[PDB]
Amino acid sequence: GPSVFLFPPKPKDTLMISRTPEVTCVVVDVSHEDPEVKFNWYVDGVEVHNAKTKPREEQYNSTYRVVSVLTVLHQDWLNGKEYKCKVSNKALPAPIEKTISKAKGQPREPQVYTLPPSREEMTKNQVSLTCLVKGFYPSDIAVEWESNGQPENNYKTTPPVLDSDGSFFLYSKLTVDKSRWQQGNVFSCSVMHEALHNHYTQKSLSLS
Amino acid sequence: GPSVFLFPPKPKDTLMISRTPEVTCVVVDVSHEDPEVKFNWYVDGVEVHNAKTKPREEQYNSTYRVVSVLTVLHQDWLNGKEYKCKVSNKALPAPIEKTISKAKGQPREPQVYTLPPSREEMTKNQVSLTCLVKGFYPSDIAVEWESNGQPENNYKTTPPVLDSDGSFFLYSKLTVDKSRWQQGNVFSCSVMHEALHNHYTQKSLSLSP
Numbered sequence: 001g002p003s004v005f006l007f008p009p010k011p012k013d014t015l016m017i018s019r020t021p022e023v024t025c026v027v028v029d030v031s032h033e034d035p036e037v038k039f040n041w042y043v044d045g046v047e048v049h050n051a052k053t054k055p056r057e058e059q060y061n062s063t064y065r066v067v068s069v070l071t072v073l074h075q076d077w078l079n080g081k082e083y084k085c086k087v088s089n090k091a092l093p094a095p096i097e098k099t100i101s102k103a104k105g106q107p108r109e110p111q112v113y114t115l116p117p118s119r120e121e122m123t124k125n126q127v128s129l130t131c132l133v134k135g136f137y138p139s140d141i142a143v144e145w146e147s148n149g150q151p152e153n154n155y156k157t158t159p160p161v162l163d164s165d166g167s168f169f170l171y172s173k174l175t176v177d178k179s180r181w182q183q184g185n186v187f188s189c190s191v192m193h194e195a196l197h198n199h200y201t202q203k204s205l206s207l208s
Numbered sequence: 209g210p211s212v213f214l215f216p217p218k219p220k221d222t223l224m225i226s227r228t229p230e231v232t233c234v235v236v237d238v239s240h241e242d243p244e245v246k247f248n249w250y251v252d253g254v255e256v257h258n259a260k261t262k263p264r265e266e267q268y269n270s271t272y273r274v275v276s277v278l279t280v281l282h283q284d285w286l287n288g289k290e291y292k293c294k295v296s297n298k299a300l301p302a303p304i305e306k307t308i309s310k311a312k313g314q315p316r317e318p319q320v321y322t323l324p325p326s327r328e329e330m331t332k333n334q335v336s337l338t339c340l341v342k343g344f345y346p347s348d349i350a351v352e353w354e355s356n357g358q359p360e361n362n363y364k365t366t367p368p369v370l371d372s373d374g375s376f377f378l379y380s381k382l383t384v385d386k387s388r389w390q391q392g393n394v395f396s397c398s399v400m401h402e403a404l405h406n407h408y409t410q411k412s413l414s415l416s417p
């Protein structure tokens with residue numbers, strides 16, 4: 001029989017009013033003989049009807065892939081509402097259901113410190129700009145880097161890591177060439193989390 | 209039938225001459241019909257005989273679970289020598305064999321920087337010391353913090369995360385009382401990795417005015 005997976009919205013989507021968060025429901029390993037699937041979508045247990053269903057698309061292993069997309073309201077997602085995808089296929093007796101929701105737990109505000117490169121690193125032609133984000137709950141978060149209004153490029157972020165006090169931290173690392181840093185250019189770490197004011201904060205860092 | 213699980217040594221003990229790395233081979237799901245099982249260790253395809261096998265200890269489901277440990281040579285594990293465990297029970301036609309080895313790939317030596325806590329943070333009870341370890345391959349590594357000889361309690365470490373050049377990096381965060389930091393206590397981040405000189409390096413951090 002098939003398998004079904006249910007993806008949450010992109011954190012930034014739910015956290016920013018201008019964007020548009022969606023819950024996604026994809027079923028894989030569907031037949032060729034009876035390959036027609038029926039979605040049923042439920043919010044806090046009451047069925048809903050605005051879901052957009054894509055028509056099935058075959059993959060290389062010749063199994064189809066069918067996804068349904070549900071727009072959610074920001075406040076509903078952040079207020080804990082359960083979304084439940086219920087998928088029916090006639091190569092299944094009992095239809096299978098999955099439910100997702102926002103990470104449960106009491107929200108805690110992240111502290112955001114920017115840390116300049118180690119003096120020892122100034123021997124290389126790349127330096128590391130560090131953004132420490134700690135003390136946040138739940139784990140759903142978004143961290144970006146930018147400079148003079150524009151998305152900075154060479155960066156990479158660690159997964160959230162459970163801290164000793166039950167909360168979460170992460171580090172994000174931006175690699176820039178030494179010259180830019182030494183010039184005096186200003187870089188900024190932008191964080192997006194439900195426990196921040198406006199769901200958004202920014203901390204800047206430049207050579208002094 | 210029965211089952212077999214093969215545990216690598218733990219990085220730090222392959223990496224320290226003075227410590228003792230061991231490959232362990234545990235068999236579970238014994239039969240009570242035939243509870244006798246015998247090992248044969250092959251280092252890179254050659255039978256080995258300095259293996260130790262602790263006796264047969266029965267667990268609550270009524271199965272037995274027995275394990276052989278094999279002390280390995282550091283240089284052998286680190287030189288990519290295959291380690292094969294061949295376990296036989298008359299509750300299974302063909303005997304069962306499993307093999308593991310350290311992860312393959314060109315080693316790359318990490319760089320180790322220590323980052324003092326933000327000034328923004330100095331308005332707190334606890335501050336954060338940061339250890340950046342980047343450029344290392346493969347990912348098997350150990351990071352530890354210490355102060356005046358003894359280890360440190362309050363620290364966590366990120367999983368290695370793949371960087372854009374194919375190497376790995378991570379961060380270790382140590383949280384200490386602002387008061388200890390401000391007295392001028394010195395804190396060390398020590399790293400163990402096979403591409404380091406002597407498998408070990410250390411960077412220290414302490415207050416600067």
Ligand SMILES: *[C@@H]1O[C@H](CO[C@@H]2O[C@@H](C)[C@@H](O)[C@@H](O)[C@@H]2O)[C@@H](O[C@@H]2O[C@H](CO)[C@@H](O[C@@H]3O[C@H](CO[C@H]4O[C@H](CO)[C@@H](O)[C@H](O)[C@@H]4O[C@@H]4O[C@H](CO)[C@@H](O)[C@H](O)[C@H]4NC(C)=O)[C@@H](O)[C@H](O[C@H]4O[C@H](CO)[C@@H](O)[C@H](O)[C@@H]4O[C@@H]4O[C@H](CO)[C@@H](O)[C@H](O)[C@H]4NC(C)=O)[C@@H]3O)[C@H](O)[C@H]2NC(C)=O)[C@H](O)[C@H]1NC(C)=O
Binds near residue numbers: 003024060
């Ligand atoms: C035929 O091929 C198709 C097509 O797949 C494609 O083709 C093949 C040949 C290869 O090239 C594939 O690499 C390629 O994807 C096969 O379809 C695939 O089937 C497998 C397994 O059936 C699925 O694996 C699952 O992957 C997802 C995570 O995948 C996301 O991220 C991937 C990044 O690598 C990306 O490739 C995926 O598309 C998907 O991306 C998301 O996309 C959505 C919508 O497009 C988007 O909103 C998001 O932005 C994006 N998200 C991310 C993060 O990128 C995941 O669902 C699965 O993980 C579960 O299962 C694992 C088994 O335990 C486990 O590791 C996980 O923890 C998790 O386990 C479950 O977790 C929770 C609790 O934590 C719980 O609900 C469950 O109980 C628990 N356990 C189980 C058993 O479920 C899994 O890793 C592929 O995603 C899928 N392909 C696509 C495109 O989705 C098909 O299988 C082949 N047919 C056969 C074999 O017959």
Ligand SMILES: *[C@@H]1O[C@H](CO[C@@H]2O[C@@H](C)[C@@H](O)[C@@H](O)[C@@H]2O)[C@@H](O[C@@H]2O[C@H](CO)[C@@H](O[C@@H]3O[C@H](CO[C@H]4O[C@H](CO)[C@@H](O)[C@H](O)[C@@H]4O[C@@H]4O[C@H](CO)[C@@H](O)[C@H](O)[C@H]4NC(C)=O)[C@@H](O)[C@H](O[C@H]4O[C@H](CO)[C@@H](O)[C@H](O)[C@@H]4O[C@@H]4O[C@H](CO)[C@@H](O)[C@H](O)[C@H]4NC(C)=O)[C@@H]3O)[C@H](O)[C@H]2NC(C)=O)[C@H](O)[C@H]1NC(C)=O
Binds near residue numbers: 211215267
């Ligand atoms: C009856 O009971 C006994 C035990 O008795 C007790 O009584 C009953 C009532 C219950 O309460 C029991 O829970 C209880 O323990 C059962 O014995 C158990 O059997 C199961 C399955 O047969 C084993 O599960 C496997 O676990 C290991 C990983 O285990 C390590 O980590 C655990 C941490 O939670 C820990 O419990 C283990 O002891 C072990 O710890 C290691 O210890 C060594 C030496 O002591 C030490 O060096 C290490 O430091 C330490 N390591 C760690 C990490 O802590 C693992 O082998 C299995 O995972 C495989 O399978 C999963 C499914 O895919 C997958 O998630 C994994 O990735 C992995 O998958 C395999 O991986 C590779 C490829 O990546 C490859 O080899 C395989 O192809 C691949 N796939 C498969 C399918 O294997 C699995 O999770 C228990 O370990 C074992 N108990 C003990 C104590 O070992 C017995 O099963 C019961 N009988 C029944 C149910 O009939």
